[PDB]
Design a protein around this ligand. Sequence first.
Ligand SMILES: [Mg+2]
Ligand SMILES: [Mg+2]
Ligand SMILES: [Mg+2]
Ligand SMILES: [Mg+2]
Ligand SMILES: [Mg+2]
Ligand SMILES: [Mg+2]
Ligand SMILES: [Mg+2]
Ligand SMILES: [Mg+2]
Ligand SMILES: [Mg+2]
Ligand SMILES: [Mg+2]
Ligand SMILES: [Mg+2]
Ligand SMILES: [Mg+2]
Ligand SMILES: [Mg+2]
Ligand SMILES: [Mg+2]
Ligand SMILES: [Mg+2]
Ligand SMILES: [Mg+2]
Ligand SMILES: [Mg+2]
Ligand SMILES: [Mg+2]
Ligand SMILES: [Mg+2]
Ligand SMILES: [Mg+2]
Ligand SMILES: [Mg+2]
Ligand SMILES: [Mg+2]
Ligand SMILES: [Mg+2]
Ligand SMILES: [Mg+2]
Ligand SMILES: [Mg+2]
Ligand SMILES: [Mg+2]
Ligand SMILES: [Mg+2]
Ligand SMILES: [Mg+2]
Ligand SMILES: [Mg+2]
Ligand SMILES: [Mg+2]
Ligand SMILES: [Mg+2]
Ligand SMILES: [Mg+2]
Ligand SMILES: [Mg+2]
Ligand SMILES: [Mg+2]
Ligand SMILES: [Mg+2]
Ligand SMILES: [Mg+2]
Ligand SMILES: [Mg+2]
Ligand SMILES: [Mg+2]
Ligand SMILES: [Mg+2]
Ligand SMILES: [Mg+2]
Ligand SMILES: [Mg+2]
Ligand SMILES: [Mg+2]
Ligand SMILES: [Mg+2]
Ligand SMILES: [Mg+2]
Ligand SMILES: [Mg+2]
Ligand SMILES: [Mg+2]
Ligand SMILES: [Mg+2]
Ligand SMILES: [Mg+2]
Ligand SMILES: [Mg+2]
Ligand SMILES: [Mg+2]
Ligand SMILES: [Mg+2]
Ligand SMILES: [Mg+2]
Ligand SMILES: [Mg+2]
Ligand SMILES: [Mg+2]
Ligand SMILES: [Mg+2]
Ligand SMILES: [Mg+2]
Ligand SMILES: [Mg+2]
Lengths: 134, 259, 158
Amino acid sequence: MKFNPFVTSDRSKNRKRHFNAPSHIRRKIMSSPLSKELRQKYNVRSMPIRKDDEVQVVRGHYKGQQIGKVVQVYRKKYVIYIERVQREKANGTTVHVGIHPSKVVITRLKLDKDRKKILERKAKSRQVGKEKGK
Amino acid sequence: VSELAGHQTSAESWGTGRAVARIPRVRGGGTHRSGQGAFGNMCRGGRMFAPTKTWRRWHRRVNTTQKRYAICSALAASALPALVMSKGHRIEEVPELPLVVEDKVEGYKKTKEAVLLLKKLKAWNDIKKVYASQRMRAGKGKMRNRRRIQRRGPCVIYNEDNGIVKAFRNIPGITLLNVTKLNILKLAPGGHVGRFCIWTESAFRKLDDLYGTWRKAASLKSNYNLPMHKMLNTDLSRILKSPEIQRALRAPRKKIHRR
Amino acid sequence: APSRNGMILKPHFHKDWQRRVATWFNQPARKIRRRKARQARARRIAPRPAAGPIRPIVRCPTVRYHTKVRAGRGFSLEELRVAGIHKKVARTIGISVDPRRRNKSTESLQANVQRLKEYRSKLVLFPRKPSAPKKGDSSAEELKLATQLTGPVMPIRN
RNA sequence: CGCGACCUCAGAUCAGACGUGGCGACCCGCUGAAUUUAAGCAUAUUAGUCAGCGGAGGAAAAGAAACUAACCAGGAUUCCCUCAGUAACGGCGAGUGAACAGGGAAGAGCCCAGCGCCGAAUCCCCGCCCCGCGGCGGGGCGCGGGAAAUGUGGCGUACGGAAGACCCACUCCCCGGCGCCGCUCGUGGGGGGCCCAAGUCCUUCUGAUCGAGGCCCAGCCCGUGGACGGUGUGAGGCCGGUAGCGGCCCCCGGCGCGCCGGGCCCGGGUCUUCCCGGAGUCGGGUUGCUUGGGAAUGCAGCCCAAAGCGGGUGGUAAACUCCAUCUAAGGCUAAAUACCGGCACGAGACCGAUAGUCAACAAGUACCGUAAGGGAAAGUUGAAAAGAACUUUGAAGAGAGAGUUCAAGAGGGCGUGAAACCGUUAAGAGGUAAACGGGUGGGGUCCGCGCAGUCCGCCCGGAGGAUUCAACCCGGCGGCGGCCGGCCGUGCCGGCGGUCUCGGCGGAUCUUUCCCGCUCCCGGGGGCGGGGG
RNA sequence: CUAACACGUGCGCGAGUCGGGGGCUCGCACGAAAGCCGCCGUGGCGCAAUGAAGGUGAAGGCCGGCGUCGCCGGCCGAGGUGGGAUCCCGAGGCCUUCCAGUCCGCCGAGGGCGCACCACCGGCCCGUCUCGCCCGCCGCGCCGG
RNA sequence: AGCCGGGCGUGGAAUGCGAGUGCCUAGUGGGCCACUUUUGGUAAGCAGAACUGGCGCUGCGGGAUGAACCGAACGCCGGGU
RNA sequence: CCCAUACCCGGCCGUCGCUGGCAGUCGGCAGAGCGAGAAAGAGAGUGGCGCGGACGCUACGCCGCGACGAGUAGGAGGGCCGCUGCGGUGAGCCUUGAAGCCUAGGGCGCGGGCCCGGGUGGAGCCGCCGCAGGUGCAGAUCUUGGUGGUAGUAGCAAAUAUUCAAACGAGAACUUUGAAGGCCGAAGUGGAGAAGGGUUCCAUGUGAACAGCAGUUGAACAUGGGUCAGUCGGUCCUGAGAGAUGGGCGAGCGCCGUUCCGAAGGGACGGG
RNA sequence: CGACUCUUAGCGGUGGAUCACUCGGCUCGUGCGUCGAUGAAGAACGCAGCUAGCUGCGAGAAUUAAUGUGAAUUGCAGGUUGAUCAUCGACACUUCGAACGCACUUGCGGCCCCGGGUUCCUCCCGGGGCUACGCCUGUCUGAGCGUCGCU
Ligand SMILES: [Mg+2]
Ligand SMILES: [Mg+2]
Ligand SMILES: [Mg+2]
Ligand SMILES: [Mg+2]
Ligand SMILES: [Mg+2]
Ligand SMILES: [Mg+2]
Ligand SMILES: [Mg+2]
Ligand SMILES: [Mg+2]
Ligand SMILES: [Mg+2]
Ligand SMILES: [Mg+2]
Ligand SMILES: [Mg+2]
Ligand SMILES: [Mg+2]
Ligand SMILES: [Mg+2]
Ligand SMILES: [Mg+2]
Ligand SMILES: [Mg+2]
Ligand SMILES: [Mg+2]
Ligand SMILES: [Mg+2]
Ligand SMILES: [Mg+2]
Ligand SMILES: [Mg+2]
Ligand SMILES: [Mg+2]
Ligand SMILES: [Mg+2]
Ligand SMILES: [Mg+2]
Ligand SMILES: [Mg+2]
Ligand SMILES: [Mg+2]
Ligand SMILES: [Mg+2]
Ligand SMILES: [Mg+2]
Ligand SMILES: [Mg+2]
Ligand SMILES: [Mg+2]
Ligand SMILES: [Mg+2]
Ligand SMILES: [Mg+2]
Ligand SMILES: [Mg+2]
Ligand SMILES: [Mg+2]
Ligand SMILES: [Mg+2]
Ligand SMILES: [Mg+2]
Ligand SMILES: [Mg+2]
Ligand SMILES: [Mg+2]
Ligand SMILES: [Mg+2]
Ligand SMILES: [Mg+2]
Ligand SMILES: [Mg+2]
Ligand SMILES: [Mg+2]
Ligand SMILES: [Mg+2]
Ligand SMILES: [Mg+2]
Ligand SMILES: [Mg+2]
Ligand SMILES: [Mg+2]
Ligand SMILES: [Mg+2]
Ligand SMILES: [Mg+2]
Ligand SMILES: [Mg+2]
Ligand SMILES: [Mg+2]
Ligand SMILES: [Mg+2]
Ligand SMILES: [Mg+2]
Ligand SMILES: [Mg+2]
Ligand SMILES: [Mg+2]
Ligand SMILES: [Mg+2]
Ligand SMILES: [Mg+2]
Ligand SMILES: [Mg+2]
Ligand SMILES: [Mg+2]
Ligand SMILES: [Mg+2]
């Protein structure tokens, strides 16, 4: 149960903050879990999604064992687009269907210097937390 | 409500004539809200009848002796299996409902230890019942931070906090109370008496110092003693079925005499 | 209009009383704030008494209460002088001092002199310089047992 | 006449500064009604309130007695409880209405003028040199300028003070710069940034699962984390978070330590001698307002107008007489207290789009009035636009097919879709407007999932089939009762009773055997406070 | 809705009762709750009334000591009449083979003790009026009782 | 006149019926009609009184109709009168 | 002979009274009563096989006898009548379908109301013990919103007047062109300005809405364009007047006053 | 029979009730408690590739710098030595407005210094800096048959 008096548990306040968070909070919010192999390798559970990571779709009409590369991340709509998930409209042109990152798992990451810095920081903090828990 | 809600406008009644209902009306202007009826409880918009005021008598005071009497009654009723079961608590496996454990549990630090202790004492069925009872509240209370409701679980009375509160904090339905600071609001949830309670050895020892015996006053309180019994032998079955009262009775007329 | 039988009443609600209403919904918050300030000051003055300076014995000035004994505003100059305390040093070493009070009698004066002498015997005075002590000072060994005391110093008893 | 001082008064786009206006919830100073009540109404009341004017701060104002009291006396201001709806005022009608004492929150005291003493010992500004300078300061040098004797600074203020002599003590305090170490209330001050546990496990519903069942014997995994929010319904374990005296980084502060420079030479007691106070002010008369203040509580105008063992107060006017208590007409001062404005937050037994702010939305917006000003209506497709390609009739609006969707029985003011009212279909009826109550009859839509009519014991008879009854033995369990022990008593009696004390708690019971401390008395006698018995 | 008052009802305590203001509880999910104070009952209401005020301020009944007792002791104790729910007593009376003879329980003339309450008669306290005598002393009086 | 104590029950007309007592209290304070009695008035469905009963507050059978007349007052029904 | 809600008999509901009865369900450990005209003991004592027996009793419950039942203003009681939220509780319900809404379906209750079936709907809801209230509508010339009959009705009648042909176009009484007949009649139905309007001006396009018929048209809508100054005006002067300083008044924002209680010229030929 | 009218039901309109949702209110509490001549509050006008409103901003005009963060913004186009967001200490900040040269038409000036004409010799054009009231301390220049002193 929350005991900090300076953080709110009000439903309307939380929803307002969620729906008007700025883009650099949207990046934090749209994070998705790593695969089992990546989790065991990096000792990290979740990672904010980037432009060209690939994904397994876990829930929804498009769940399956297809590795799909993300094409772009629409933070305004809280959505990512995957190069394989898509549907054709009336005229026949094909448009991407939005998938929320929370229903998404990374197969392997795009290892940029900032990405590996973030991974090492997360792993170090988790390991020191576990060592304190010892 | 706001002290000036409904009175923000400036309106006068058109008065006799004009074939209108003789009520204040928004004056002038080329707007829908013009000549519409401003004040009064019967008008759209406008003031409520008898606006609620912040200086309502929200709080009440109860006599200290009455509070202590209620606490004593709740404590006494918590020791009767019939009342505790009728409160809904599942205690059919509990070895002894005035449940007392040693002071070693007062130093528990992890939730797993508390869960194991509950399983050993066979009170885990009440926690399972609470888990099953966890549901969604009905009505407009959902949009007012009262989204989720659940059943009350057992109470745990301790004497010193040595991680006891942290250990049992996360288990749903468990209510922790210090033995020196009991409150009726948690001892008798609902106004109904007979909540299931689990005592520690130190708290059980301190009980009779807190509230005194029949022949000894309470040491920790200034001058308090247990409330006197109005009737001692409350076994009505005996009081009827005893020879000395049955002797002084007339024969029971039990033949019906219909019209 | 009067009913059958009852009391004549004079309610004082003929003014705009609803505009000047003092609700007490901030009473618990006020108590919490006063407490916090109290403990903050008690921590601020580290070994000094939390209540404050000692005060004197006085008699309530009325036929209704002249049998009772209060805590006064401060010791007067006659009492300080006959107890051998300077009026300026008393305030800085913890004795409340006022110059308004007279002394018509001798019993009260002697009682307050006894109080001041007891206070001198009881207080522990820290070095003006922590390294080198001075003549009018307390030795080092009893400094280790200097602690704040709660409530008024030497409380008044009837 | 001229030249030179001083006085008084001008002029500047002279050098350098300062004020204006706004907000105004809370505060201070003025001015200040009438609705209303009195069942009329003029005094009263509303009310020193609304409106009007001025001036601030983070609080303001008040404030260290020209006080309260009459007691065995208290002792600045402010705030709460009580005094108390009381003393009192009032066409003594309606109504109005304090204060002292007492308990608390907080608690802090001080400074001038005068009287005097010190060679004006004082202050501001310009130039140069040295320090750091984003709150313009410190040191030095200037035969630099000015203020000021029509009075600056040190000592000093009613609690007395000063000077001299004699005894006693007899020095580290503050400031301007520089560096250092550690600490910082509940948690180590504050602020910011980045991170930290556990199922998308196996089946099964669904359009979509966060649903349902299971996960052994570690009763899936975490839990100091089962608040909340998001995600295609309903999630402790998907994600953000949540808990944690959890982690890392950056910045600012406060407290201590050290160094340099600068100022400072300071106190207490006794004796002797001196000195000591605020004027068109107090006070009196009158007038007007105000107050509970009543032969005048407070304020103000006018007239009169002081004294120094004096003056003020002592709640009924006056004279005489003793007592009590302060020292007016100069000044500063935090805390407790107030806060419908502002910034940033937390919460709710509140409202849920005719409600709640007027305003959930391009709302003080559209719009009205010359202007002062007045002032709305208006939320909802869908999980995702997947927002209907294409064919066909029409000039087109608009349709029929086709298609998306779980659903178009959600088609762009699209969730649900009521009533009033209307169109059409079906049934029935119809010349005393219609409608209605009671009683039947007739016809209908649906229902009984009606249409050979209930079941239940105990027997009698017949056809069957079982590992089969009663009685015994073994073991266990329970109920009831009478011998051995044990526990409790809102019962009694006793003991040489009790860890050292030979238990604790209390007592308006005692204590020349008690003891200690304090005061009085010439080591001694008596009283008081505490401890002991 | 708030405040005041009256009465009726329910609960706690009871000649008392009540922490509402404040404080102590590691402040803080609930909790702005709850607990505690007792040398924090100041204070309010109640326990005493009456008078404008100075003020005063709530029983007495029997025997021995000087009835034509001055006046000390021994006592006994907060009235009396009527009506009074209940309780006590109890003449008599409640069965069966008879007879002697009990136990226990129920009945019941009359007679007791009489709750609350009502009515009436007395008594006591304060103001006021009339009559009349006596007593006390630190100050013997425009004194006090 | 008041006190005490004592003795007398055939409960001293008929009929009927439990009674006494205490708080708190709403609405009302425009009335109207009829037999009889009665004042003013030429008189009135006028104005004003006394007694009783009604209407108002009340439906039902009758007076064809009807606030007051005659009968009778009321829970939902069957039979009889 | 006929009939009222009157009277008599019977059934049922309720109220009131009896301050009525029942703890006695006393069972192989037992013995089944306290209805019977007569105040009170089925009194206790001592001497001459088959193992068996319905319901009950939420005592705030159940049962039995009688009498009675009008009602405005008004008073009281009970509501397992209803609405919203809170503390408890139902191992409650619910995407295998909640709320809400509709119904010629089946029922319950005297009633307030409620329970099922069917349909629509798509995400929450209710029972019981308590607590709280902004808690129940037929009216108030009630407020807001919506919709009728009237009614395809009143009406589209002030200022003489239109007709022929062609073009465009789906579409012509109303547009455009040509022809004819008319009116305004120079104090105009003409040509230009001021005030006011503010893009209405011009070209192209459209025909959803508006132009109270219609439109191929418009001052409508949609795209674009358009206002050129030494000499035309403003700009300068002063008029009636308005308004600072000095001064005066004023609690005060300020007001009076305009030469009046003012050291009111910052200019110049020339000379040094 | 048919029309018309009435009733009930099905369906379809009309309308927008009910129910369920809620980035909004209301109320209570907490900490802080800060505007302006170095130009405030308020108003006006402008600023986007496509932009009317709302919002943001000021000729550096839906924003510059710096720091943190670390790959987007998005309706369509275009193009890691750091995109976008956030923070915000550097810089900038049009016209009115206490509003300040005089007035309110944006009209008319004055003084000083620069750049064009000149080649300062004056005009003219452009640019920059000053030019409000009251008041304080000081400076300078003064006035007075005001009080005096030497000639
Ligand atoms: Mg945290
Ligand atoms: Mg409103
Ligand atoms: Mg609902
Ligand atoms: Mg009345
Ligand atoms: Mg009136
Ligand atoms: Mg009048
Ligand atoms: Mg008046
Ligand atoms: Mg007044
Ligand atoms: Mg005002
Ligand atoms: Mg100002
Ligand atoms: Mg300020
Ligand atoms: Mg101040
Ligand atoms: Mg003083
Ligand atoms: Mg005082
Ligand atoms: Mg009182
Ligand atoms: Mg009078
Ligand atoms: Mg007054
Ligand atoms: Mg006081
Ligand atoms: Mg204190
Ligand atoms: Mg001096
Ligand atoms: Mg599951
Ligand atoms: Mg996580
Ligand atoms: Mg007055
Ligand atoms: Mg007097
Ligand atoms: Mg003075
Ligand atoms: Mg003073
Ligand atoms: Mg002051
Ligand atoms: Mg809270
Ligand atoms: Mg709605
Ligand atoms: Mg809608
Ligand atoms: Mg659907
Ligand atoms: Mg719809
Ligand atoms: Mg038909
Ligand atoms: Mg009354
Ligand atoms: Mg008459
Ligand atoms: Mg009647
Ligand atoms: Mg009748
Ligand atoms: Mg007739
Ligand atoms: Mg009949
Ligand atoms: Mg009958
Ligand atoms: Mg009735
Ligand atoms: Mg219907
Ligand atoms: Mg939905
Ligand atoms: Mg409500
Ligand atoms: Mg209605
Ligand atoms: Mg027509
Ligand atoms: Mg013309
Ligand atoms: Mg023209
Ligand atoms: Mg045109
Ligand atoms: Mg038209
Ligand atoms: Mg030209
Ligand atoms: Mg003027
Ligand atoms: Mg129809
Ligand atoms: Mg723009
Ligand atoms: Mg930048
Ligand atoms: Mg950057
Ligand atoms: Mg002009």
